[PDB]
């Protein structure tokens, strides 16, 4: 157990600022904040914790408001003192996930610097597969240590306690056991994080620089149109009405639109063949086989994707705008894909259907304020371009380097015919071919996504590989350095470890075959798109443009522009994005602007 004699609590100035004398002088110190809510613009400070040696911490207790709270240093008061330090870039700091603190403190116009180890992001550099990233984990993992719980001290269910009712000695060793901790973590990671120049290079210059452009993303928030969203949720209503009463009227009585029970009853009952169709999905979906010539199913299938849309973007956003900002904040998790690519929740934006017209409403939804106007860069298919460096193939290269359209680059080659003849449909098969690629997908799974037969899918990557032959070297040599070392790293040295590559298990293995063709071509982007995040905000910061950035979704940065600036800051943008990050993956940036995210888009 942790008592109330391993951490001190300090409750004067005179204490504060021996220990702020100390925290001067230290090579590298933990830090910590507590407040009263997980909601970062509008939480309030509750305390902070400082650990400057493994076993050395303390707690101060700001304000902590429970009936007869001891007297505490004054929350203004121990700002003022602690701000220096605070927004010294010389004095280095240590801390489980930054970015919440950073926001914290930024609440009451203090600028955190020197914002050098993230325990999380160390960990998740070292191996992001190796299990959560979380304080609770990594202390049982690195130093068979169980830390205190928040459920521990504040509670479980509704009744649960916000920190500032918290007796003082309970919340700190809750407080102090997190910086403390949190600095052996480093103590113990950091030098592994040095063993290899590769992790070491992606966790300094890409991971880091990162949690600050990602805390002030969240916090700028996104401007949200509830009555546009209104509108969509009655008309969907409406929508789903119709299609049931169409459904019905096709056959007869009254059902669910629930597979493999009350449709296999119609469908295939008045003709076709007795298998459902699972909502597995993406390789065979029978409903929408049958749609090219069949009535009911085609409305079931369109029924479905309303209900699903509706209850999780139309219901939901309207209720996650905050009261403080009348903006929407979404989360963003920086240590959670095995890629290294960002993950987003409430709302998990990367959901929001792309071709689809509904998923275009939704996009609408995304509106610039008064004399604003939203701005769209987007990398052009850089997964692509990334594959065709990696393969050293001329012609993939030389078909971005004139322009040309890749899909139909592809088909005419692999179908042999000019270039301005190639049809609808092999523009098609070549574009299912180059994403197969990516994801190192198998000549049935293709045969499953372009509907011809086996074989048939064979032949055309037979004639792919041989008019474009350095792209089967690549996808030989990465899963021969895959089996040989354990693990595939990307242009900037990031790893994915597979340890299932020698499994002995059949698909349990060629899932790690997958993965170590694709995360080289995924990492490699998602690298590219953090390092033109730190870039343009860096800008950002400088020069102090009329913008914001807003938003972070798929291979886009979606930003809020000043109308009269729209042109010279295209520029910008355009430029930092395709010429401060990489420059040996042949890349171009689409940018577009609107009044909404979908006209921009
Ligand atoms: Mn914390
Ligand atoms: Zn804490």
Same mark, same amino acid.
């Given at each position: 157990?942790?008592?109330?004699?391993?951490?001190?609590?300090?409750?004067?100035?005179?204490?504060?600022?021996?220990?702020?004398?100390?925290?001067?002088?230290?090579?590298?110190?933990?830090?910590?904040?507590?407040?009263?809510?997980?909601?970062?613009?509008?939480?309030?400070?509750?305390?902070?914790?400082?650990?400057?040696?493994?076993?050395?911490?303390?707690?101060?207790?700001?304000?902590?408001?429970?009936?007869?709270?001891?007297?505490?240093?004054?929350?203004?008061?121990?700002?003022?003192?602690?701000?220096?330090?605070?927004?010294?870039?010389?004095?280095?700091?240590?801390?489980?996930?930054?970015?919440?603190?950073?926001?914290?403190?930024?609440?009451?116009?203090?600028?955190?610097?020197?914002?050098?180890?993230?325990?999380?992001?160390?960990?998740?550099?070292?191996?992001?597969?190796?299990?959560?990233?979380?304080?609770?984990? #990594? &202390? =049982?993992?690195?130093? $068979?240590?169980?830390? %205190?719980?928040? +459920? *521990?001290?504040?509670?479980?269910?509704?009744? @649960? !306690?916000?920190?500032?009712?918290?007796?003082?000695?309970?919340?700190?060793?809750?407080?102090?056991?997190?910086?403390?901790?949190?600095?052996?973590?480093?103590?113990?990671?950091?030098?592994?994080?040095?063993?290899?120049?590769?992790?070491?290079?992606?966790?300094?210059?890409?991971?880091?620089?990162?949690?600050?452009?990602?805390?002030?993303?969240?916090?700028?928030?996104?401007?949200?149109?509830?009555?546009?969203?209104?509108?969509?949720?009655?008309?969907?209503?409406?929508? #789903? &009405? =119709?299609?049931?009463? $169409?459904?019905?009227? %096709?056959?007869? +009585? *009254?059902?669910?639109?629930?597979?493999?029970? @009350? !449709?296999?009853?119609?469908?295939?009952?008045?003709?076709?063949?007795?298998?459902?169709?699972?909502?597995?999905?993406?390789?065979?979906?029978?409903?929408?086989?049958?749609?090219?010539?069949?009535?009911?199913?085609?409305?079931?299938?369109?029924?479905?994707?309303?209900?699903?849309?509706?209850?999780?973007?139309?219901?939901?956003?309207?209720?996650?705008?905050?009261?403080?900002?009348?903006?929407?904040?979404?989360?963003?998790?920086?240590?959670?894909?095995?890629?290294?690519? #960002?993950?987003?929740?409430?709302?998990?934006?990367?959901? %929001?259907?792309?071709?689809?017209?509904?998923?275009?409403?939704?996009? @609408?939804?995304?509106?610039?304020?008064?004399?604003?106007?939203?701005?769209?860069?987007?990398?052009?298919?850089?997964?692509?371009?990334?594959?065709?460096?990696?393969?050293?193939?001329?012609?993939?290269?030389?078909?971005?380097?004139?322009?040309?359209?890749?899909?139909?680059?592809?088909?005419?080659?692999?179908?042999?015919?000019?270039?301005?003849?190639?049809?609808?449909?092999?523009?098609?098969?070549?574009?299912?071919?180059?994403?197969?690629?990516?994801?190192?997908?198998?000549?049935?799974?293709?045969?499953?996504?372009?509907?011809?037969?086996?074989?048939?899918?064979?032949?055309?990557?037979?004639?792919?590989?041989?008019?474009?032959?350095?792209?089967?070297?690549?996808?030989?040599?990465?899963?021969?350095?895959?089996?040989?070392?354990?693990?595939?790293?990307?242009?900037?040295?990031?790893?994915?470890?597979?340890?299932?590559?020698?499994?002995?298990?059949?698909?349990?293995?060629?899932?790690?075959?997958?993965?170590?063709?694709?995360?080289?071509?995924?990492?490699?982007?998602?690298?590219?798109?953090?390092?033109?995040?730190?870039?343009?905000?860096?800008?950002?910061?400088?020069?102090?443009?009329?913008?914001?950035?807003?938003?972070?979704?798929?291979?886009?940065?979606?930003?809020?522009?000043?109308?009269?600036?729209?042109?010279?800051?295209?520029?910008?943008?355009?430029?930092?994005?395709?010429?401060?990050?990489?420059?040996?993956?042949?890349?171009?940036?689409?940018?577009?602007?609107?009044?909404?995210?979908?006209?921009?888009?």
């Amino acid at each position: 157990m942790i008592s109330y004699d391993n951490y001190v609590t300090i409750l004067d100035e005179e204490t504060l600022k021996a220990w702020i004398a100390k925290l001067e002088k230290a090579p590298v110190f933990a830090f910590d904040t507590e407040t009263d809510s997980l909601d970062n613009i509008s939480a309030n400070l509750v305390g902070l914790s400082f650990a400057i040696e493994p076993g050395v911490a303390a707690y101060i207790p700001v304000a902590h408001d429970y009936l007869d709270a001891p007297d505490q240093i004054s929350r203004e008061r121990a700002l003022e003192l602690l701000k220096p330090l605070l927004e010294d870039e010389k004095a280095l700091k240590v801390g489980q996930n930054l970015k919440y603190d950073r926001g914290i403190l930024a609440n009451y116009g203090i600028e955190l610097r020197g914002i050098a180890f993230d325990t999380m992001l160390e960990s998740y550099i070292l191996n992001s597969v190796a299990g959560r990233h979380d304080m609770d984990s #990594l &202390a =049982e993992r690195w130093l $068979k240590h169980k830390t %205190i719980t928040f +459920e *521990e001290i504040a509670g479980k269910g509704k009744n @649960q !306690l916000t920190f500032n009712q918290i007796a003082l000695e309970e919340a700190g060793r809750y407080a102090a056991e997190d910086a403390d901790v949190t600095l052996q973590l480093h103590l113990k990671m950091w030098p592994d994080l040095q063993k290899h120049k590769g992790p070491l290079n992606v966790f300094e210059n890409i991971e880091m620089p990162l949690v600050p452009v990602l805390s002030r993303i969240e916090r700028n928030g996104v401007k949200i149109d509830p009555k546009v969203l209104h509108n969509h949720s009655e008309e969907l209503t409406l929508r #789903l &009405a =119709e299609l049931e009463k $169409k459904a019905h009227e %096709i056959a007869g +009585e *009254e059902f669910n639109l629930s597979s493999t029970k @009350q !449709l296999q009853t119609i469908l295939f009952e008045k003709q076709g063949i007795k298998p459902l169709k699972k909502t597995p999905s993406t390789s065979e979906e029978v409903l929408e086989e049958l749609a090219l010539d069949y009535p009911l199913p085609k409305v079931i299938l369109e029924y479905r994707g309303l209900a699903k849309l509706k209850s999780t973007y139309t219901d939901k956003l309207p209720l996650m705008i905050n009261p403080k900002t009348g903006r929407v904040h979404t989360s963003y998790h920086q240590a959670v894909t095995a890629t290294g690519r #960002l993950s987003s929740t409430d709302p998990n934006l990367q959901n %929001i259907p792309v071709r689809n017209e509904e998923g275009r409403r939704i996009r @609408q939804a995304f509106i610039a304020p008064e004399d604003y106007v939203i701005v769209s860069a987007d990398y052009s298919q850089i997964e692509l371009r990334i594959m065709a460096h990696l393969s050293r193939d001329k012609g993939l290269l030389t078909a971005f380097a004139e322009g040309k359209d890749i899909h139909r680059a592809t088909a005419a080659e692999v179908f042999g015919l000019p270039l301005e003849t190639v049809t609808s449909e092999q523009r098609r098969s070549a574009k299912a071919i180059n994403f197969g690629l990516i994801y190192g997908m198998s000549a049935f799974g293709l045969a499953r996504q372009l509907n011809i037969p086996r074989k048939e899918a064979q032949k055309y990557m037979d004639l792919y590989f041989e008019r474009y032959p350095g792209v089967l070297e690549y996808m030989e040599r990465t899963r021969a350095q895959a089996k040989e070392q354990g693990y595939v790293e990307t242009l900037d040295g990031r790893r994915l470890y597979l340890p299932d590559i020698k499994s002995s298990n059949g698909a349990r293995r060629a899932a790690a075959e997958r993965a170590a063709i694709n995360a080289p071509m995924q990492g490699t982007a998602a690298d590219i798109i953090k390092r033109a995040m730190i870039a343009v905000d860096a800008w950002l910061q400088a020069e102090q443009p009329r913008v914001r950035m807003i938003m972070q979704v798929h291979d886009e940065l979606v930003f809020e522009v000043h109308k009269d600036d729209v042109d010279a800051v295209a520029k910008q943008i355009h430029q930092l994005m395709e010429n401060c990050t990489r420059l040996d993956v042949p890349l171009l940036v689409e940018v577009g602007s609107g009044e909404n995210w979908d006209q921009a888009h």
